[PDB]
Amino acid sequence: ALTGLTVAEYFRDIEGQDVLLFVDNIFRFTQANSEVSALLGRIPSAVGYQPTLATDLGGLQERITTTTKGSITSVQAVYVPADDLTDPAPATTFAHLDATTVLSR
Amino acid sequence: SNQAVKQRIRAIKNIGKITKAMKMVAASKMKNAQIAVEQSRGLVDPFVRLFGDFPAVNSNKSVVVAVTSDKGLCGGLNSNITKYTRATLATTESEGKDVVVVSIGDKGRSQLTRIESQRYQLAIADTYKVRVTFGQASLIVEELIKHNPQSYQILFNKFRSAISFKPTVATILSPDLLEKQLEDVTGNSLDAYDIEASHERSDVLRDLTEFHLGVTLYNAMLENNCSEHASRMSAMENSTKSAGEMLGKLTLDYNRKRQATITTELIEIIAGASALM
Amino acid sequence: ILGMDELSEEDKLTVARARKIQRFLSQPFQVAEVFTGTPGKYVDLADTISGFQGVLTGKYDDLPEMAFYMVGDIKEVKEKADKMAKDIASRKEADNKKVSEELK
Amino acid sequence: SIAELGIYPAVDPLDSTSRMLNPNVIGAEHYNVARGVQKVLQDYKNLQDIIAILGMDELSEEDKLTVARARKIQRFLSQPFQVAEVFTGTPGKYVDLADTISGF
Amino acid sequence: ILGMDELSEEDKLTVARARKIQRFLSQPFQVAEVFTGTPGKYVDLADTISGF
Amino acid sequence: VGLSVSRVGSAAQFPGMKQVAGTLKLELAQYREVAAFAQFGSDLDAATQYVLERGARLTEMLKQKQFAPIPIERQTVAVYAATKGFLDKVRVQDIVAAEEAVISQVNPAVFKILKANGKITPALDAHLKAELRKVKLPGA
Amino acid sequence: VGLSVSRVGSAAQFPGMKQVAGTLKLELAQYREVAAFAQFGSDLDAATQYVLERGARLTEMLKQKQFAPIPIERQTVAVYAATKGFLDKVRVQDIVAAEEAVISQVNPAVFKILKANGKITPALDAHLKAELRKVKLPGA
Amino acid sequence: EAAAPAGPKEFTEVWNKKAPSTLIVPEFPSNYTAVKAVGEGQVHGDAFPVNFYTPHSILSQAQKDTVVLPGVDGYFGVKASHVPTIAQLKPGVVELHSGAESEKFFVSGGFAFVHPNGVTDICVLEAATLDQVDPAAVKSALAAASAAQPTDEFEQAANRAAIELYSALESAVEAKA
Secondary structure, three states: OHHHHHHHHHHHHOOOOEEEEOOOOHHHHHHHHHHHHHHOOOOOOHHHOOOOHHHHHHHHHOOOOEOOOOEEEEOOOOOOOOOOOOOHHHHHHHOOOOOOOOOOO | OOOOOHHHHHHHHHHHHHHHHHHHHHHHHHHOOOOOHHHHOOOOHHHHHHOOOOOOOOOOEEEEEEEOOOOOOOOOHHHHHHHHHHHHHHHOOOOOOEEEEEEEOOOOHHHHHHHOOOOEEEEEOOOOOOOOOHHHHHHHHHOOOOOOOOEEEEEEEEEOOOOOEEEEEEEEEOHHHHHOOOOOOOOOOOOOOEEEOOOOHHHHHHHHHHHHHHHHHHHHHHHHHHHHHHHHHHHOOHHHHHHHHHHHHHHHHHHHHHHHHHHHHHHHHHHHHHOOO | OOOHHHOOHHHHHHHHHHHHHHHHOOOOOOOOHHHHOOOOOOOOHHHHHHHHHHHHHOOOOOOOOOOOOOOOOHHHHHHHHHHHHHOOOOOOOOOOOOOOOOOO | OOOOOOOOOOOOOOOOOOOOOOHHHHOHHHHHHHHHHHHHHHHHHHHHHHHOOOOOOOOOOOOOHHHHHHHHHHHHHOOOOOOOOOOOOOOOOOOOHHHHHHHO | OOOOOOOOOOHHHHHHHHHHHHOOOOOOOHHHHHHHOOOOOOOOHHHHHHHO | OOOOOOOOHHHHOOOOHHHHHHHHHHHHHHHHHHOOOOOOOOOOOOOHHHHHHHHHHHHOOOOOOOOOOOOHHHHHHHHHHHHOOOOOOOOHHHOOOOOOOOOOOOOOHHHHHHHHHOOOOHHHHHHHHHHOOOOOOOOO | OOOOOOOOOOOOOOHHHHHHHHHHHHHHHHHHHHHHHOOOOOOOOOOOHHHHHHHHHHHHHHOOOOOOOOOHHHHHHHHHHHHOOOOOOOOOOOHHHHHHHHHHHOOOHHHHHHHHHOOOOHHHHHHHHHHOOOOOOOOO | OOOOOOOHHHHHHHHOOOOOOOOOOOEOHHHHOOOOOOOOOOOOOOOEEEEEEOOOOEEEOOEEOEEEEEEOOOEEEEOOOOOOEEEOEOOEEEEEEOOOOEEEEEEOOOOEEEOOOOOEEEEOOOEEEHHHOOOOHHHHHHHHHOOOOOOOHHHHHHHHHHHHHHHHHHHHHHOOO
């Protein structure tokens, strides 16, 4: 997801454009960063998530912003784990989200 | 303690499906019994314009009939006319009137005994089991000519729509015991009519107020049975709301315990690992 | 779920008495009057045993639920059931004859 | 829940599973009775959600028959044990395989 | 459970108004026109506010 | 049925089965809301019961033997017989014998046509519709 | 309102607001009691409909829009105009329009007396009952 | 002679002094009908309102110009401004004419009121039309009803009602138009 940022950040900062970014399944960004914390021997946080979940997620989401050059707007697919909006992976994600688009069957 | 909160979501989820089944069971029963209520509303009013409407008479003997339901998920329907019974059974109480309290429906004998038991004599029940017919409502009426009051009081719920059910007091006077006495105005208001019966006016009115009793009784336990299904419909939609608000507070409580038991079992694993490493 | 309409009337007397003793267990504190406004009531032990026994036998089923809320003893439930009753009549008659006219 | 109801041996009739319950192993007259007993005992458990709330008057006598059939089936799975004569107080019964299939 | 022609003329005025708004939130897409036939339509913001 | 999903979906389904199982899953989806209301038999609605009786025609249709895999043209002929309406005749407690009244009695010429064409053509939709009326269903 | 507490700040607040908000917390305490008793509309007592019409009046008075904080003397008068009469004419909808109709049309010299004295003097209680009767309320 | 001034209106203000004040007044069957007896009008010429009723049906409530009613003295007909009449009816055929068209209902007995405003209120229990009566099994039970003659006066009355019902029913299935 940081490789996707860096391609979108070149269009923002050098090309000066209004870039779209699609972080498909922002939960799998959380889930993969939670695995690399567990493999590095870090003590898991509440609900088995990494202690750095707020800052591993917030480090991604703060580069998606508007600058004086251009902007990056990200449409991030959100998975809710146990149909549980109070789970710490959507609850940390929803603090960054500025809109929700719910697609229904 | 995480299975006791999970077996309660087992309970409230089926109650919320039982009480939504009974919402539309009572809603389909409200409309196939509406095709019998407005048909039965026809025969009531030619007796209310021939004999008038005289609720506040000081009769010697009265029979008050509060007709209630048989099953009891109605939502205070059988109790609202129980308080309207004694509101009627104290207004017309003016000179020491003999009163026979009758209940049609099994939910009437359990609530009229609490209010007025010593002047209670009769209990009709199991009447809405198959359907309500006029021959059945005649036999229920014919047990009220076994006692010979001067008036009859019928307490029922008038089914106006699916929302409003105003209670009704329909009064039937005994033929010349009090009924022609209340028509007597500078002569009589009954002397306009030419009687075309075999026998006298005194015993055609004997035939005509039992027929006025059996019609209003048949309408009462038909208007009430359709007022029953429309109050159960509003009661079983207030209990699916209550079993979805309870289910919502119980899933928030379950998700909190689901999150807390993954954190607890994880801290038990790290502590046992840090004690070895 | 079902409401109080589906209760037996032996059980309705339970709910009516238990809502009364639930409110009667509360009382205003002399340290809480600085933020509640209601003055605090020290209730003697003989008055709590006398008061709650009357609600259990049934001597005070006449009074409503809110007559028992934030009162000292059973003398004050009857003092508050009147004030509640008294103000169901008096709600108006502050129209003219004021201290609020032009010159006075 | 089978033990608190008094049915002994408290065997869960649905949760008990064997690999000898194929029709090509125990025959078809044993497999269809066992598959039929399990069907009536499962329908009763889906009805017992509504029996304990309402009370067995609105089942249109197809589901009222399978409540009384399963209640007979539930007690007929109970059996006095020869080693529980000191507990139950009854002599134990050895039921042959043919008499079980014929009974159920 | 009551009926479509049961409820009031104002309450069914909303039903007629919502159903032609619930339909009007549809839109044909330009990337979907290679397999749906209908052409795609970019709708401007002022034409959406004034259209609704 | 409500929880079993396939993200690939019906783009990898047998056509001909895709014609009739697309409305099988719809008639079972409406039945699942109407499910757990089937204990109200005397309390009936004449529209809610039609999706309740048809939804029970189809859950008893999908029942299968422990080790008896069915070829795909015999599955879509059998679910044609239950979705299009040929088994409203059959009572719900003998549908699992009514498909052996359907498979064994419909002549096997229609199976190799449906296998080779790989869809229910309107030329074949006329034939096995007629073949599904000359079957001896357990009706009474 | 039922859960929000400030006991240290109470008996330290504006003296004029302390007169008019003791009944505001009171008429909101009864409003939550009788909205808990009437979870649906079928039973109408018309002595609690006074509370449902005054409680919905005071709720609309208390809601305000963002980034426009109100001075305490213009906030005391708007609750003075609502816990007392002067707003029972307006139904529930134009109360936000009536509050700015109260604040603008009333003489701004009555806001200086409430600010400088700290509380509603009986000299000012009479004048502010008088100035609240010549307010053109938008609900007519 | 009328020392009890009753009525729905007078019952209201008396009930407000004995009942609790929380309850609205009970409704009355006068509040659900606008058609009264002494309310002058309700004819306008030739066709008068005929409310032919049944416990399970409202068979007609529109106007007719002549109604042939089967009274116990005999068949009579009702015109527009007929005399006020409380007529007990035998088992017979109520004939509704509004003009050239004529429907024939055979009724079981039950009164028919002509009110002073000219509205006819036929009030019977079972009112079958003559299209759905059979002429076969009527004499199969009438010859049976002309046989069982007991000394029990209760069944003698019900057998008398059995005889005169099928006797008038057969007499009105023979001479049909």
